[PDB]
């Protein structure tokens, strides 16, 4: 009956679930277990490049807190 | 975008049916009529049967006449399902096609129960019908008719109030009443243009004066009023089928003249006169007294007529077949002037055109 | 051998895809068109076999000749047949398409569509029922299932 | 840089699929086809109405191009002037549509 | 005795005018159409599972032809040619002679199944129930001449389907 | 003004809804009491740096610290 | 690693387009009181695979092309624009997070008519060219209300950023302040993709293409259908986003986009086709005046309510 | 809940074909898994089933044998495999098997 269309909808729904789940896990893996830094504006890029310089490993996402000041 | 001239070239299904009829007897030429309007099989059977029975100066029994009216209205349901659903399928409403061909499938099961074939029954014959209704058939006809108005209702829910179906059909193919009469239109083509004419009311045949029904009359002459006329004719066919199921009499189904209709098979194998008559009706056939009839009935497309000329022998001398679709497709050129190309498929739809009877 | 096994499995694959995805172009000539429209109706439903309803004649896989072929339309039938991409198949439906039928001795009827096109499946009836036409379509599928295009290509 | 890589990847996938569609069934050695339309050979008649709907598209698309900075223009400090000029642009688009109406420009493609 | 389809003059009070304008602006009949299509989405479909499920037939069904036998092995056809005189398609070709015991029997009984219109005038013209049009409809061939039946093919259809044909004739013969 | 409006609402309701929505869009910002708050929020959004002033000696209304009482306040924006 | 992300975007697009054909045939089957395909695979699941293998080994149709180059470029452009409409789509994070993703999508959908136009001129049929001109005029017609409705809705967003459009709809779906824009948007995106009741390419342009390239046009069209349903979902039916669990947003917008694609499938099995002038009448005389009136209303409305969204 | 009745009918269909192996057997040969009363079996192996709660057309069916007259019919099921004594019952020319 009408539940016969549901395997195809399940296949198509898994195929739509894959890209967003995949880009979320890749954005966590490539950015140190966090979200990707949204830099739409040049102040956000200024802070992000300052993070890249203050980390010392040439990575913006490796954060430095109070342990880096004396 | 406009259409200045439409020249329909036909003869792509001309088989020379009514020359082949001249070399076959009346019973042998009966199944040619199933194949003319091939969605209205038993109605064309009834028109040829009434033509031959008018020339033979005999009449069917009452039960045969009620069977012919019952199956003529079942046939009218078949044909208007075909008309409405293909006219919607060509425009784009493809879904009530599939919804109504299950009902059309069940009426073909009715045909197969009563004759053995689903379409070309050879069931309505000159003299009556070929065989009596098997038991439990009328109960299932009632069970069909009890449900079929809801099918018409959901068809009418999908199309009638829809603005897209109205825009494709309301201003399209307007026929005036005088030009409908002048182009030889018949049936819904007249009745959509206001013309109060129906052959079952005016020039009635078998028992149509004993059934009570209404005749839907349009008001604007367009595709939309002809659509509403065909849907209401399905309603009134359900009304006539209810009256035929309630008023069905007992009795015989062939005429009891064994020089016209063949005897029963039990008495053919017992009586000498019945075996002689069986022999001579299935080899020579009955002779028909010489004369020319034009017997016309109200087929579901319009006036279906037979001009049958008998020379006194067991074969037709001439059998001209008047179809409604011939004059309707002739009037296609006037009905499409000033319209667009996508209107022409709606105009060819609203003239219920089946090319077997157009071409013969 | 190994390559014989490969062409056997590839024949099974391409014959599976060709019989499980038949696209018909139906010539609605005559009364047999009504019964093809019943073979597409919900009871029999060609679409559940992968047999679509009314493909265009230039992407269709099989030509169902359903009705009477007259002399006036036989060049149009041959034109539509020549315009089909290969592999193309022809189902002849009903007596008039098969052998002329009830109009066999007529002056204006082609006595069978096999005088015009090569026919694969002859479906008999007047009309053959939607169940009988579906039987002919499944017999066409079985005919496609035993095709040996790559095995004969490997053995040539 | 990620966007240029993405565009190049999509163009390469599309070109690969188009090459497979135009060259995999060419290896079929089927048959040479001898002697491979509603109008026969008449010229294409120019339709004035198709050109009219295309130019009406172009002009209203230019008015759209004027309307496109509005989500940024709502952030201004001169809001009375901004609101007046925004309503004036959408009003001039509506006057263009009304003049296209009343001089029978939207006809037979209404 | 007649009715006027589409002769309704609509109301012009503000109630009906606002009803029609809400139908225009809010698409009431379009949602009615979507509701009817959604109603058929949740119905059980009418599809039978062919070839495993079969369409319902009656015992009158007119399918493949078969020459029958009496219940002794003797064939019923006494070569009388009524089925080919009545045949509207001239599909039946009959030639006969007295056989070795003097019985009036056919030597040629051909039916062209591609001329045949399957109307069953042969089985109703047959005085001895020899030719019948049986219940087989699944007999599509791959070649045209396989639908050109001789007497051997028709007697084999009789021997093949007699257990069904006799029961169908038994169910129907009091209507004949 | 009354029969004409019902007539155009009966024949052409899309156009009546069009001119009604456009007329409300024209007249209603001039009548709304919240139009002033749009101005006051857009001018209170600090895109730039508040470049301080040299304290010459007489600026009684300019603060020395952001948390001082004098200066522009946005308690109306928090409360509303 | 980014190339893996591009592959996990573009390959599941192709798979979902492949099985959307099965879902279309099944849903149109059950809405027509029959079944869809259930023989070729278990519950019909191998029907698109069988059909793709069928089309890629069918004979090339071999047309006489006017231009060979544009005959090649029209499927290339159609597939490339069908794939690049996905990269700013936030679900909940896009592949290419850009500041102007909305305007990017409107631009790359405006470029989609060149495939129709080049396929129509690259065929030698004048009838195919007339059909291509009709389809191009239809699409560029409904792009007008796409642009204006989209602008009017983004006046509540503050920017052309698609990721900001989720933040916009955290308290309410944006269909509640903008359902007339939503319904005209929905019919206009139905008319973008030549989809019924606006499919005059099936009512009596790429008919000279062989089975391979016609299948590529077909799959680009269904990629556009899935994409415009996802874009309508993000635009009017914005789901809840928990940043620590992004799969909540992903499951939610996937369910909503599947329902909206089934709603396209449910419209096409319910209505007859417009005549060409009738949908031109629908655009220029019904949708565009209300679209301009609601554009004035959504310009003046955040000012009269003091609800102007933030720029950032 | 009546959804659990639906899931129980599905699971007893899985149980009623002799396990998952017979369930998948009838799923891939029949494209249909519903269970029925075994009306009979012919001299070839065709099994004939009823379910009078199914509608008219579905209420009788045949699971064809995997071998008939020397031909492997595991996938090549044929409508003409029905012998004439079951051809009345299956096509509903009578009520009686
Ligand atoms: C037809 C004219 C319609 C618009 C009328 C002016 C609307 C308006 O607010 O203008 C103020 C605007 C801007 O004034 P404003 O109030 O924004 O000025 C503040 C100063 N700035 C801009 C730095 C923030 O225009 C003018 O003052 C002068 C230009 C338009 C003057 C009228 C032209 C009429 C031409 C008829 C031919
Ligand atoms: C990824 C999406 C799906 C992609 C497509 C489907 C996947 C499978 C692709 C390969 C399928 C097999 C080759 C194409 C089909 C060939 C069918 C055919 O007509 O064969 C006869 C043809 C020609 O055979 P022929 O020489 O007898 O010619 C027949 C025509 N006459 C006689 C009139 C001249 O065979 C071939 O062209 C063989 C090509 C190679 C086959 C594969 C080799 C191994 C590959 C691994
Ligand atoms: C995003 C999720 C989905 C969104 C909803 C959409 C789902 C429903 C889809 C149904 C199937 C549709 C199939 C295609 C149909 C195409 C035809 C069609 O509908 O044409 C549109 C029809 C066309 O008109 P027509 O053709 O029906 O009517 C005749 C028109 N004349 C006279 C010109 C010939 O209507 C519209 O254009 C209406 C568009 C939307 C209107 C929105 C109005 C909102 C209310 C405003 C305020 C009103 C009160 C006044 C002011 C008060 C102030 C306080
Ligand atoms: C070196 C040796 C190998 C050489 C290369 C081959 C690699 C493997 C290729 C796939 C498998 C090949 C065999 C194909 C099937 C052969 C057996 C067969 O025909 O089984 C029939 C059976 C259904 O039976 P049927 O006849 O349909 O019955 C009607 C209902 N009673 O059919 C079924 O049950 C279904 C059959 C499905 C066929 C396989 C699935 C489709 C193909 C997938 C791979 C190719 C496509 C990849 C993706 C393309 C793009 C989406
Ligand atoms: C001041 C506010 C802002 C105004 C400008 C902004 C407008 C936004 C919407 C854009 C409109 C663009 C198109 C306008 C075209 C107008 C001309 C027109 O359509 O006239 C024809 C029409 C009759 O249609 P017809 O020609 O017969 O069409 C064939 C199909 N039957 O004729 C009609 O239907 C009559 C149309 C005129 C009368 C409409 C009255 C509406 C009143 C609503 C309530 C009050 C709203 C306040 C504003 C009033 C402004 C007059
Ligand atoms: C993100 C998820 C996307 C998912 C997409 C796909 C969804 C559907 C997945 C497949 C579902 C099951 C398909 C089963 C097909 C039928 C197989 C079958 O029964 O084939 C039988 C055939 C003949 O075998 P034979 O030995 O002759 O049998 C006689 C027994 N006495 O033998 C053969 O035909 C040979 C074997 C063929 C096997 C083909 C299997 C299907 C392949 C489909 C491609 C996708 C694979 C899955 C991808 C996602 C999971 C990783
Ligand atoms: C007939 C030929 C073949 C036809 C088929 C193939 C061509 C047609 C289909 C592809 C169309 C490609 C479109 C390329 C540009 C799209 C606009 C664009 O890049 O917008 C996105 C983004 C703007 O957003 P924003 O957030 O401001 O930027 C990041 C900084 N914050 O901007 C950025 O992120 C900027 C990134 C750096 C600059 C990128 C430049 C790309 C290369 C040049 C254009 C490539 C296409 C050339 C041919 C087009 C033919 C139509
Ligand atoms: C290799 C990736 C897939 C390539 C494209 C082939 C499969 C998808 C399109 C095939 C198709 C299907 C399934 C289909 O169902 C269909 O009918 C509606 C078509 O013709 C209009 C098709 O073209
Ligand atoms: S074989 Fe007979 S029933 Fe069939 S189309 Fe021909 S004339 Fe009509
Ligand atoms: S089959 Fe019957 S009718 Fe025909 S020749 Fe034989 S006995 Fe006579
Ligand atoms: S069924 Fe009719 S056409 Fe066929 S052989 Fe018998 S009499 Fe002749």
Query: Distance between CA G157 and CA G312 in Å, rounded?
Result: 10
| H/E element, B216 | strand B216-217
The minimum-distance atom of ligand 11 relative to the CA of E89 is 3
| Nearest in space to C49 (alpha carbons), one of E42, G20, E48 | E48
In a 10 Å sphere around its CB, with 0-12 CB exposed, 13-18 middle and 19+ buried, how is residue F58 labelled? exposed
CB of G213 within 8 A of CB of G142? Answer: no
Q: Which two tokens stand for residue E171?
A: 């169910």
- What does the DSSP assignment read for B163-190? HHHHHTTSSSS---HHHHHHTT--THHH
Q: Which two tokens stand for residue B61?
A: 């029994």
The CA-atom distances, in angstroms, between D96 and each of B354, D84, D93, G38, G296 are 49, 18, 5, 54, 15
Cα-Cα-Cα-Cα torsion G19, G22, G27, G32, nearest 10 degrees, comes to: 170
| Nearest in space to D67 (alpha carbons), one of G151, G293, F25 | G151
User: Taking CB atoms and a 6 Å cutoff, what residues make up the pocket around ligand 7?
Assistant: A 40; D 3-4, 7, 11; G 73, 76-77, 80-81, 84, 98-100, 104, 111
**Helix (H, G, I), strand (E, B), or coil: what is residue B295?**
strand
Check residue G274 and report its DSSP letter. P
Resolution for the entry shown, Å: 2.8
| H/E element, H47 | strand H47-50
H28/G39 touch (CB, cutoff 8 Å), yes or no: no
Instruction: Say how many C-beta atoms besides its own lie within 10 A of residue B284's C-beta.
Output: 13
> In the sheet that E92-98 helps form, which strands lie side by side, from edge to edge?
E92-98, E104-112, E148-149
Query: Distance between CA A7 and CA E18 in Å, rounded?
Result: 45
Query: Distance between CA B301 and CA B83 in Å, rounded?
Result: 9
The CA-atom distances, in angstroms, between G108 and each of G81, G88, G113 are 6, 11, 10
| Nearest in space to G157 (alpha carbons), one of G181, G189, G138 | G181
List, in sequence order, every residue forming a beta bridge with H40; answer none if it has no partner: H48
Half-sphere exposure (CA, 13 Å, Cβ side) for H65? Answer: 17
A1/E44 touch (CB, cutoff 8 Å), yes or no: yes
According to DSSP, the β-strands at E131-133 and H37-41 are unpaired
In a 10 Å sphere around its CB, with 0-12 CB exposed, 13-18 middle and 19+ buried, how is residue D68 labelled? middle
> How many residues in total does chain D contain?
110
Instruction: Say how many C-beta atoms besides its own lie within 10 A of residue B275's C-beta.
Output: 15
Q: Which of E67, E68, E82, E107 to mutate to test the pocket of ligand 10 (most atoms within 8 A of CB)?
A: E82
Helix pair angle (C2-19, C130-145), 10° resolution: 160
Query: Distance between CA G225 and CA G239 in Å, rounded?
Result: 20
Q: Is the CB of E154 under 6 A from ligand 10?
A: no
Residue G190 contacts A, CB cutoff 8 Å: no
Residues of G in contact with A31 (CB under 8 A): none
Q: Is the CB of E125 under 6 A from ligand 10?
A: yes
Nearest CA to ligand 3 atom 44: G180
Query: Distance between CA B208 and CA B225 in Å, rounded?
Result: 25
Give the nearest partner residue to E137 out of C102, C131, C138, using CB atoms: C131
Per-position b or e across H49-84, b if 16+ CB within 10 A of its CB: bbeeebeebbbbbbbbbeebeeeebeebbbbebbbb
The residue ranges of every structural domain in chain G are 1-312
Query: Backbone breaks in chain A (C–N > 2.5 Å) follow which residues?
Result: none
CB of B225 within 8 A of CB of B92? Answer: no
G39/H31 touch (CB, cutoff 8 Å), yes or no: yes
The minimum-distance atom of ligand 9 relative to the CA of C95 is 1
Give the nearest partner residue to B99 out of G33, G272, G277, using CB atoms: G33
Give the nearest partner residue to G300 out of F15, F17, F25, using CB atoms: F25
> How many residues in total does chain B contain?
360
Sole residue written with tokens 């001439």:
B318
Nearest CA to ligand 9 atom 2: C126
Residues of D in contact with C82 (CB under 8 A): 33-35
CB of C114 within 8 A of CB of C92? Answer: yes
CB of B302 within 8 A of CB of B185? Answer: yes
Query: Distance between CA C22 and CA C15 in Å, rounded?
Result: 11
The Cα diameter of chain A in Å comes to 71
∠ CA C41-C46-C52 to the nearest 5 degrees? 110
The minimum-distance atom of ligand 9 relative to the CA of C102 is 7
The minimum-distance atom of ligand 11 relative to the CA of E120 is 1
According to DSSP, the β-strands at B216-217 and E3-4 are parallel
- What does the DSSP assignment read for G15-79? HHHHHHHHHHHHHHHHTTTS----TTTGGGTTHHHHHHHHHHHSPP----BS-HHHHHHHHHHHH
Q: For residue D37, give how far its alpha carbon lies from the nearest alpha carbon of chain F (Å).
A: 41
Query: Distance between CA E93 and CA E109 in Å, rounded?
Result: 6
Query: Distance between CA G60 and CA G47 in Å, rounded?
Result: 22
Query: Distance between CA A52 and CA A59 in Å, rounded?
Result: 5
> Residue E114 contacts by C-beta under 8 Å, 6 or more apart in sequence?
C95, C98, C99, C100, C101, C112, C122, C124, E144, E147, E148
The CA-atom distances, in angstroms, between C145 and each of C63, C119, C155, H76 are 18, 17, 19, 9
Query: Distance between CA B164 and CA B88 in Å, rounded?
Result: 11
CB of G74 within 8 A of CB of G119? Answer: yes
Q: Which two tokens stand for residue G220?
A: 């680009």
The CA-atom distances, in angstroms, between C40 and each of B30, B105, B274, E91, G196 are 29, 11, 46, 31, 21
Q: For residue G61, give how far its alpha carbon lies from the nearest alpha carbon of chain C (Å).
A: 6
| Nearest in space to F42 (alpha carbons), one of G204, D77, B248 | D77
Chain B 125-154, CB below 8 Å of chain E: which residues?
130-132, 134, 154
In a 10 Å sphere around its CB, with 0-12 CB exposed, 13-18 middle and 19+ buried, how is residue F67 labelled? exposed
**What are the helix and strand counts (H, E) for chain E?**
5, 6
Query: Distance between CA B22 and CA G311 in Å, rounded?
Result: 89
DSSP percent split of chain E into helix, strand, coil, nearest 5: 35, 15, 45
Three-state secondary structure readout of D33-46: CCCCCCCCCCCCCC
> Residue G216 contacts by C-beta under 8 Å, 6 or more apart in sequence?
D17, D18, D21, G75, G78, G79
Residue A1 contacts E, CB cutoff 8 Å: yes
Give the determination technique: cryo-EM
Instruction: Say how many C-beta atoms besides its own lie within 10 A of residue E98's C-beta.
Output: 10
Contacts for G251-258 with beta carbons within 8 Å, 24 or more apart?
A: G251/A17, G253/A20, G253/G91, G254/A13, G254/A16, G254/A17, G254/A20, G255/A13, G257/A16, G257/G226, G257/G229, G257/G230, G257/G233, G258/A9, G258/A12, G258/A13, G258/A16
According to DSSP, the β-strands at C62-66 and C24-28 are parallel
């Amino acid at each position: 009956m009408w539940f016969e269309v549901l395997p195809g909808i399940a296949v198509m729904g898994v195929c739509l679930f894959i890209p967003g789940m995949a880009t979320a896990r890749i954005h966590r893996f490539s950015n140190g277990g966090r979200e990707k830094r949204v830099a739409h504006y040049s102040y956000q890029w200024y802070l992000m490049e300052r993070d890249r310089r203050v980390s010392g490993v040439n990575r913006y996402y490796v954060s430095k807190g109070l342990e880096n000041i004396d | 975008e406009m259409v200045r001239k439409c020249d329909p070239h036909i003869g792509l299904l001309h088989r020379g049916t009514e020359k082949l009829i001249e070399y076959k007897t009346y019973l042998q030429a009966l199944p040619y009529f199933d194949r003319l309007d091939y969605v209205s099989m038993m109605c064309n059977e009834q028109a040829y049967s009434l033509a031959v029975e008018k020339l033979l100066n005999i009449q069917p029994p009452p039960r045969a006449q009620w069977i012919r009216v019952l199956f003529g209205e079942i046939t009218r349901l078949l044909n208007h399902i075909m008309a409405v659903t293909t006219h919607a399928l060509d425009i784009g409403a493809m879904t009530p096609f599939f919804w109504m061909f299950e009902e059309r499938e069940k009426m073909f099961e009715f045909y197969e129960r009563v004759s053995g074939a689903r379409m070309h029954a050879a069931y309505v014959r000159p003299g009556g019908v070929h065989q009596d209704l098997p038991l439990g058939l009328m109960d299932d006809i009632y069970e069909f008719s009890k449900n079929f108005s809801l099918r018409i209702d959901e068809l009418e829910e999908m199309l009638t109030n829809n603005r897209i179906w109205r825009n494709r059909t309301v201003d399209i193919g307007v026929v005036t009443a005088e030009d409908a009469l002048n182009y030889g239109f018949s049936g819904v083509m007249l009745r959509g243009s206001g013309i109060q004419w129906d052959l079952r009311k005016t020039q009635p045949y078998d028992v149509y004066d004993q059934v009570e029904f209404d005749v839907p009359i349009g008001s604007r002459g367009d595709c939309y009023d002809r659509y509403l006329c065909r849907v209401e004719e399905m309603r009134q066919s359900i009304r006539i089928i209810s009256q035929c199921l309630n008023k069905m009499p007992p009795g015989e189904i062939k005429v009891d003249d064994a020089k016209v209709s063949p005897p029963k098979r039990a008495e053919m194998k017992t009586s000498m006169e019945s075996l002689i008559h069986h022999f001579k009706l299935y080899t020579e056939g009955y002779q028909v007294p010489p004369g020319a009839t034009y017997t016309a009935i109200e087929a579901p497309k319009g006036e279906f007529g037979v001009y049958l000329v008998s020379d006194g022998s067991s074969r037709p001398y001439r059998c001209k077949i008047k179809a409604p679709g011939f004059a309707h497709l002739a009037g296609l050129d006037k009905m499409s002037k000033g319209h667009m190309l996508a209107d022409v498929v709606a105009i060819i739809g609203t003239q219920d055109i089946v090319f077997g009877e157009v071409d013969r | 051998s190994r390559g014989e096994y490969v062409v056997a499995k590839l024949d099974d694959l391409i014959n599976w895809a060709r019989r499980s995805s038949l696209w018909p172009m139906t010539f609605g000539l005559a009364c047999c068109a009504v019964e093809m429209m019943h073979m597409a109706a919900p009871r029999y439903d060609m679409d559940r076999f992968g047999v679509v309803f009314r493909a265009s004649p230039r992407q269709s896989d099989v030509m169902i000749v359903a009705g009477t072929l007259t002399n006036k339309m036989a060049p149009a039938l041959r034109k539509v047949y020549d315009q089909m991409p290969e592999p193309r198949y022809v189902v002849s439906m009903g007596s008039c398409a098969n052998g002329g039928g009830y109009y066999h001795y007529s002056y204006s009827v082609v006595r069978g569509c096999d005088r015009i096109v090569p026919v694969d499946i002859y479906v008999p009836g007047c009309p053959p029922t939607a169940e009988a036409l579906l039987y002919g379509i499944l017999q066409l599928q079985k005919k496609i299932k035993r095709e040996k295009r790559l095995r004969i290509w490997y053995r040539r | 840089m990620n966007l240029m890589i993405t565009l190049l990847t999509n163009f390469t996938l599309a070109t690969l699929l188009v090459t497979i569609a135009f060259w995999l069934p060419q290896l079929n050695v089927y048959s040479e086809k001898t002697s491979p339309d509603p109008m026969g050979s008449a010229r294409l008649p120019f339709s004035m109405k198709f050109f009219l709907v295309a130019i009406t598209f172009l002009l209203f698309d230019l008015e759209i191009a004027l309307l496109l900075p509005l989500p940024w223009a709502s952030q201004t400090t001169n809001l009375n002037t901004m609101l007046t000029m925004a309503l004036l642009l959408i009003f001039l688009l509506a006057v263009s549509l009304a003049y296209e109406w009343t001089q029978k420009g939207l006809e037979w493609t209404e | 005795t007649y009715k006027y389809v589409n002769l309704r003059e609509p109301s012009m009070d503000m109630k009906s005018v606002t009803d029609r304008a809400a139908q225009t602006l809010l698409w009431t009949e379009l949602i009615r159409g979507l509701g009817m299509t959604l109603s058929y989405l949740f119905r059980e479909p009418a599809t039978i599972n062919y070839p495993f499920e079969k369409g319902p037939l009656s015992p009158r069904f007119r399918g493949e032809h078969a020459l029958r036998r009496y219940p002794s092995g003797e064939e019923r056809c006494i070569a009388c040619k009524l089925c080919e005189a009545v045949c509207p398609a001239q599909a039946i070709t009959i030639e006969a002679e007295p056989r070795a015991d003097g019985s009036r029997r056919t030597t040629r009984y051909d039916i062209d199944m591609t001329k045949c219109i399957y109307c069953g005038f042969c089985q109703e013209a047959c005085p001895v129930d020899a030719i019948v049009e049986g219940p087989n409809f699944e007999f599509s061939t791959e070649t045209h001449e396989e639908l050109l039946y001789n007497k051997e093919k028709l007697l084999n259809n009789g021997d093949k389907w007699e257990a069904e044909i006799a029961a169908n004739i038994q169910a129907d013969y009091l209507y004949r | 003004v009354a029969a004409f409006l019902k007539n155009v609402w009966a024949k052409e309701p899309v156009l009546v809804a069009s001119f009604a929505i456009a007329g409300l869009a024209v007249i209603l910002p001039t009548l709304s009491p919240y139009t002033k708050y749009s101005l006051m929020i857009n001018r209170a959004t600090p895109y730039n740096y508040p470049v301080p002033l040299r304290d010459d000696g007489n600026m009684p209304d300019v603060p020395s610290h952001p948390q001082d009482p004098q200066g522009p306040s946005l308690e109306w924006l928090k409360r509303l | 690693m980014f190339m893996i992300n591009v592959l996990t975007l573009i390959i599941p697009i192709l798979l979902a387009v492949a099985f959307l054909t099965l879902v279309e045939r099944k849903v149109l089957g059950y809405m027509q009181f029959r079944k869809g395909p259930n023989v070729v695979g278990p519950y019909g699941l191998l029907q698109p695979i069988a059909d793709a293998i069928k089309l890629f080994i069918k004979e090339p149709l071999r047309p006489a092309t006017s231009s060979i180059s544009m005959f090649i470029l029209a499927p290339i452009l159609a597939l490339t624009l069908a794939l690049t409409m996905w990269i700013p789509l936030p679900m909940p994070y896009p592949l290419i997070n850009m500041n102007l993703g909305v305007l990017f999508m409107l631009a790359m959908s405006s470029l989609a008519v060149y495939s129709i136009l080049w396929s129509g001129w690259a065929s030698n049929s004048k009838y195919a060219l007339i059909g291509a001109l009709r389809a191009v005029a239809q699409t560029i017609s409904y792009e007008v209300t796409l642009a204006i409705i989209l602008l009017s809705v983004l006046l509540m967003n503050g920017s052309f950023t698609l990721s900001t459009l989720i933040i916009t709809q955290e308290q309410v779906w944006l269909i509640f302040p903008a359902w007339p824009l939503a319904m005209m948007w929905f019919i206009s995106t139905l008319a973008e993709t030549n989809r019924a009741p606006f499919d005059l390419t099936e009512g009596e342009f790429n008919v000279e293409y062989a089975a391979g390239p016609f299948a590529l046009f077909f799959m680009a069209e269904y990629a556009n259908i899935i994409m415009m349903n996802i874009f309508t979902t993000t635009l009017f039916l914005g789901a809840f986003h928990n940043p620590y669990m992004p799969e909540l947003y992903t499951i939610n917008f996937t369910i909503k986009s599947l329902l909206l694609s089934i709603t396209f499938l449910w419209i096409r099995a319910s209505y007859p086709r417009f005549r060409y002038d009738q949908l031109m009448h629908l655009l220029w005389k019904n949708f565009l005046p209300l679209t301009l009136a609601l554009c004035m209303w959504h310009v003046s409305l955040p000012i009269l309510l003091s609800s102007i969204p933030p720029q950032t | 809940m009546e959804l659990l009745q639906v899931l129980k009918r599905g699971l007893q269909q899985v149980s009623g074909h002799g396990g998952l192996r017979g369930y998948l057997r009838v799923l891939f040969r029949a494209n249909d898994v519903r269970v029925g009363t075994l009306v009979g079996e012919d001299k070839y192996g065709n099994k004939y089933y009823e379910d009078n709660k199914q509608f008219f057309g579905r209420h009788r069916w045949v699971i064809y044998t995997t071998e008939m007259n020397g031909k492997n019919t595991f996938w090549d099921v044929d409508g003409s495999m029905v012998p004439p004594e079951w051809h009345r019952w299956l096509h509903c020319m009578t009520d009686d098997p």
